[PDB]
Amino acid sequence: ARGPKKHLKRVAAPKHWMLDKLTGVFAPRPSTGPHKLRECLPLIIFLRNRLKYALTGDEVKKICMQRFIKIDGKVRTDITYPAGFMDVISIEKTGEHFRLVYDTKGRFAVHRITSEEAKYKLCKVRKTWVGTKGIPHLVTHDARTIRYPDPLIKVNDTIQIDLETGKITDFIKFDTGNLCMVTGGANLGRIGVITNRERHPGSFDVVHVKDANGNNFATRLSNIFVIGKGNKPWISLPRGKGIRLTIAEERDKRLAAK
Amino acid sequence: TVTIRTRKFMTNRLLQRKQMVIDVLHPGKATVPKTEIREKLAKMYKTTPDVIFVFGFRTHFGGGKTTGFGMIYDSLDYAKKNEPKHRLAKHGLYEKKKTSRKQRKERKNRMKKVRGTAKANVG
Amino acid sequence: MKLNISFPATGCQKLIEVEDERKLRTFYEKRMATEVSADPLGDEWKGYVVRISGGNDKQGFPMKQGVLTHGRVRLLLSKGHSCYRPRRTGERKRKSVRGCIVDANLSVLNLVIVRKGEKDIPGLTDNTVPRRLGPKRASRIRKLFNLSKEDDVRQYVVRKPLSKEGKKPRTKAPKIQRLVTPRVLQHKRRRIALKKQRTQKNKEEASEYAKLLAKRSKEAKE
Amino acid sequence: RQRHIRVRKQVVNIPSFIVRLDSQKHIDFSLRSPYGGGRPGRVKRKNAKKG
RNA sequence: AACUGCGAAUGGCUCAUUAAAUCAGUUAUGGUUCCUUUGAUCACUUGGAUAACUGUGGUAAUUCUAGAGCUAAUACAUGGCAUUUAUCAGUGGUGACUCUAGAUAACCGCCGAUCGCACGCACGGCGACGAUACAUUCGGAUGUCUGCCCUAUCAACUUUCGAUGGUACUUUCUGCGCCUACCAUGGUGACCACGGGUAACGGGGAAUCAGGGUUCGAUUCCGGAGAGGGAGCCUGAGAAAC
Numbered sequence: 001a002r003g004p005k006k007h008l009k010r011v012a013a014p015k016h017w018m019l020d021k022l023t024g025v026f027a028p029r030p031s032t033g034p035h036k037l038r039e040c041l042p043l044i045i046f047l048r049n050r051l052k053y054a055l056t057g058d059e060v061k062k063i064c065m066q067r068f069i070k071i072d073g074k075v076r077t078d079i080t081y082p083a084g085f086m087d088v089i090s091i092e093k094t095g096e097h098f099r100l101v102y103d104t105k106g107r108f109a110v111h112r113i114t115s116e117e118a119k120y121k122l123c124k125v126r127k128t129w130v131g132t133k134g135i136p137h138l139v140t141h142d143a144r145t146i147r148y149p150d151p152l153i154k155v156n157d158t159i160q161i162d163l164e165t166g167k168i169t170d171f172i173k174f175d176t177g178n179l180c181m182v183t184g185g186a187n188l189g190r191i192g193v194i195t196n197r198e199r200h201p202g203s204f205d206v207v208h209v210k211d212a213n214g215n216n217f218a219t220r221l222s223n224i225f226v227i228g229k230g231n232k233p234w235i236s237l238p239r240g241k242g243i244r245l246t247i248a249e250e251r252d253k254r255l256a257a258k
Numbered sequence: 259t260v261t262i263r264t265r266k267f268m269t270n271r272l273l274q275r276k277q278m279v280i281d282v283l284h285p286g287k288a289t290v291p292k293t294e295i296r297e298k299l300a301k302m303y304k305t306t307p308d309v310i311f312v313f314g315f316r317t318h319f320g321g322g323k324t325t326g327f328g329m330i331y332d333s334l335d336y337a338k339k340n341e342p343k344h345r346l347a348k349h350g351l352y353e354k355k356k357t358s359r360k361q362r363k364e365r366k367n368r369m370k371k372v373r374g375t376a377k378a379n380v381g
Numbered sequence: 382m383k384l385n386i387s388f389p390a391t392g393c394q395k396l397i398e399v400e401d402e403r404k405l406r407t408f409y410e411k412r413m414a415t416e417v418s419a420d421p422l423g424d425e426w427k428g429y430v431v432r433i434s435g436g437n438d439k440q441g442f443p444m445k446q447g448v449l450t451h452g453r454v455r456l457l458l459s460k461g462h463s464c465y466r467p468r469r470t471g472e473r474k475r476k477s478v479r480g481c482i483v484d485a486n487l488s489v490l491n492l493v494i495v496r497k498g499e500k501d502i503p504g505l506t507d508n509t510v511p512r513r514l515g516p517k518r519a520s521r522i523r524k525l526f527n528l529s530k531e532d533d534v535r536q537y538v539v540r541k542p543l544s545k546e547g548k549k550p551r552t553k554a555p556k557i558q559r560l561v562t563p564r565v566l567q568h569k570r571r572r573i574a575l576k577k578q579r580t581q582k583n584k585e586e587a588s589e590y591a592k593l594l595a596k597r598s599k600e601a602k603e
Numbered sequence: 604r605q606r607h608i609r610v611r612k613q614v615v616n617i618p619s620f621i622v623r624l625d626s627q628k629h630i631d632f633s634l635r636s637p638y639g640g641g642r643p644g645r646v647k648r649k650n651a652k653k654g
Numbered sequence: 655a656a657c658u659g660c661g662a663a664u665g666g667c668u669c670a671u672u673a674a675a676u677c678a679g680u681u682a683u684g685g686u687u688c689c690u691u692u693g694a695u696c697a698c699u700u701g702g703a704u705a706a707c708u709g710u711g712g713u714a715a716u717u718c719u720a721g722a723g724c725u726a727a728u729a730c731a732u733g734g735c736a737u738u739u740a741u742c743a744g745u746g747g748u749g750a751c752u753c754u755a756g757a758u759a760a761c762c763g764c765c766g767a768u769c770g771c772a773c774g775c776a777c778g779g780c781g782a783c784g785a786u787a788c789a790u791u792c793g794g795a796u797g798u799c800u801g802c803c804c805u806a807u808c809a810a811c812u813u814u815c816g817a818u819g820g821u822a823c824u825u826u827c828u829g830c831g832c833c834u835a836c837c838a839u840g841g842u843g844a845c846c847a848c849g850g851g852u853a854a855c856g857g858g859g860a861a862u863c864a865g866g867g868u869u870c871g872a873u874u875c876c877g878g879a880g881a882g883g884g885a886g887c888c889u890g891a892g893a894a895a896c
Binding site for chain 5: 001002003004005006007009011012025026029030031032033034035036037078081082127128129130131132133134135136137138139140142143144145146147151154155166199200201202203
């Protein structure tokens with residue numbers, strides 16, 4: 001209470017990490033970085049709990065310290081790096097490239113991508129300000145400050161940057177008709193086409209999204225991440241893009257695959 | 259009689275290893291030791307038993323079958339770097355120093371009193 | 382009262398016990414600042430002048446400069462103050478200190494030879510001891526000798542003779558610090574290189590953004 | 604309770620083992636039971652070495 | 655070994671205090687502070703001190719220290735913006751700026767004397783460390799709405815010496831009777847104020863239950879509080895810290 005907390009209990013850990021109980025008392029507290037604590041996936045969980053490349057936290061550090069893992073092109077040696085949404089985890093030693101994108105269950109699924117991909121990443125603009133000497137700036141969702149952006153880029157659009165240079169390559173404006181992946185709970189991981197935006201002055205703007213199968217659902221503006229222009233996503237989507245099959249439909253697909 | 263399955267093999271080129279869950283079938287035997295499993299796993303993967311590290315064999319109720327985990331390294335040098343010191347101690351590789359952890363805190367708290375090069379004369 | 386005398390010129394020091402209190406009557410009113418003559422101490426100290434540098438009382442508490450008293454007091458000693466060593470950053474422990482005024486109720490009185498007299502003490506002035514450590518900084522060597530900006534300090538190193546019994550003799554030299562090496566010139570050159578890369582990237586990012594606004598304003602003008 | 608009954612190659616020692624349909628046709632003696640194909644118990648082996 | 659840097663403000667333990675307080679849901683900082691992480695932004699190779707070490711010591715005693723002789727720095731020190739007001743105009747903004755930028759008049763820190771690797775062509779690659787007018791993360795701090803047990807054998811309470819509001823400061827990381835000075839005489843209450851009790855930390859929860867409920871929650875998670883009792887401070891981004 002006298003300062004910043006540096007521990008995290010497993011019971012208090014984010015649920016989408018899928019941590020068990022009887023392994024330990026503490027959960028890996030993600031270090032400060034681009035993404036928030038509740039909205040990230042530390043590098044130790046992705047290598048050990050997801051990819052099974054390591055069995056203990058010590059084996060995770062033996063991998064990160066050999067400089068084999070690059071988040072968004074840059075090597076990271078901290079095993080508790082946030083590595084949140086849209087981040088690219090490239091492993092040159094095994095020639096594997098990942099991109100953290102939520103599934104229909106609202107969890108960071110193992111989404112392998114190609115070598116032609118993993119060179120760019122999509123970022124949502126969160127703040128636009130004019131620096132000194134009349135230089136406009138930009139704030140993405142992963143703490144990337146961009147100088148001299150396109151004047152058409154606004155506080156809610158999605159830009160496309162290049163991991164080698166960090167410069168904006170393209171941008172998708174926020175309007176009715178574009179794809180989006182909800183990232184705000186109870187719809188986390190659902191992908192659909194924006195159909196309507198309710199503007200509430202002084203409150204949270206509620207948008208309405210429609211899936212490809214016709215499922216309609218609403219969420220908040222801060223949870224919308226524009227994915228593509230129209231209905232074509234600019235990224236590779238995992239299996240079960242955003243349909244979010246009901247509990248009755250998931251049972252049918254489960255026993256039919258037997 | 260004694261067989262090996264390795265039903266969850268994994269390459270894992272990051273640690274120069276070979277991860278797999280080893281299933282041993284021993285109907286009349288008693289939880290086949292590591293020395294017999296390692297030498298039987300070496301001929302299965304055409305390697306030497308000096309770079310095979312097996313652990314965590316839990317025999318199921320009723321007997322006849324046990325499951326564990328195995329590690330096969332590319333070389334003995336990569337094993338000494340990535341394998342924990344306690345599994346190397348199970349072999350003739352690593353020798354843990356008998357330091358008596360309770361006594362380590364004693365020498366430390368005694369050195370916290372004197373200052374300078376006299377700490378070496380404490381312990 | 383014991384007397385801890387030290388000779389800074391020769392680097393020697395010795396402890397002597399003065400039983401005859403008549404010799405110490407000169408010190409019983411001098412603070413820890415004055416340089417007084419050691420003539421009453423005996424015929425050996427004729428022409429010597431000693432400076433009161435400190436001392437301990439009969440209980441071991443050291444004399445603190447500036448207290449302006451002859452009795453023990455308790456002061457809140459912070460970092461930087463003498464007679465105190467902080468165990469933690471920002472710690473201030475109130476300790477008892479002896480005043481700077483020299484009295485008869487002192488165990489040892491520290492004295493510093495500021496002027497050599499006529500005779501010499503065998504254990505205090507006759508013997509000598511080297512400095513045991515030569516200069517390490519590059520400029521300290523140039524000031525020790527008459528070296529100018531053109532001479533090489535690598536040649537004018539101490540290189541003390543380090544030889545013990547039972548091993549091979551060798552010579553040990555300190556690492557010259559603050560030296561103008563070919564490596565430190567590369568860092569200064571690379572620091573300038575990065576200063577020009579930022580200047581190069583600012584004029585490009587400002588030009589491409591000006592060219593973007595230029596071609597875009599021509600569209601909306603019509 | 605004497606480790607004789609097995610369910611599809613698993614020696615089950617609990618009498619309250621609720622048997623489902625797919626596990627009912629696989630109830631048999633254990634492969635190490637004197638009733639099944641195994642060495643006879645210590646009583647048979649001790650009474651045999653006597654006479 | 656020691657100097658320097660950083661941590662020691664997390665954890666762990668307890669439930670004493672505390673009854674619109676804590677706490678929970680909601681939410682506001684456009685009234686704020688944030689080490690670190692992340693992205694942006696960026697030669698006279700100078701000066702003199704010090705520890706370790708060497709040596710002389712004191713005290714019955716301490717993780718007490720004194721005196722002298724040395725010697726290092728990413729220690730110490732040297733070698734247009736930012737900062738404080740005033741004026742003018744209206745680049746990107748927000749539901750709404752006294753917003754962000756710009757132009758004037760001035761006022762008065764920052765702008766690398768560091769380190770490693772690779773060694774090639776006076777120029778050179780890859781890093782480490784370091785600066786913050788910025789963003790970002792971890793989050794603090796204080797507010798908005800609503801919600802607590804028993805008690806009238808507690809019916810009026812607050813207001814000298816702030817109670818409620820206004821004005822101007824002062825102060826604080828900021829808004830605010832937080833404080834000061836001058837005015838106003840208010841503010842709260844049978845819809846239960848104020849006062850008292852709690853063998854009262856609050857909540858997520860537990861037990862028992864047809865429905866409805868009753869009772870419990872010191873106790874592993876979250877938040878708060880305390881380190882014998884109070885009070886006052888140092889250092890630091892962060893403590894009224896044990």
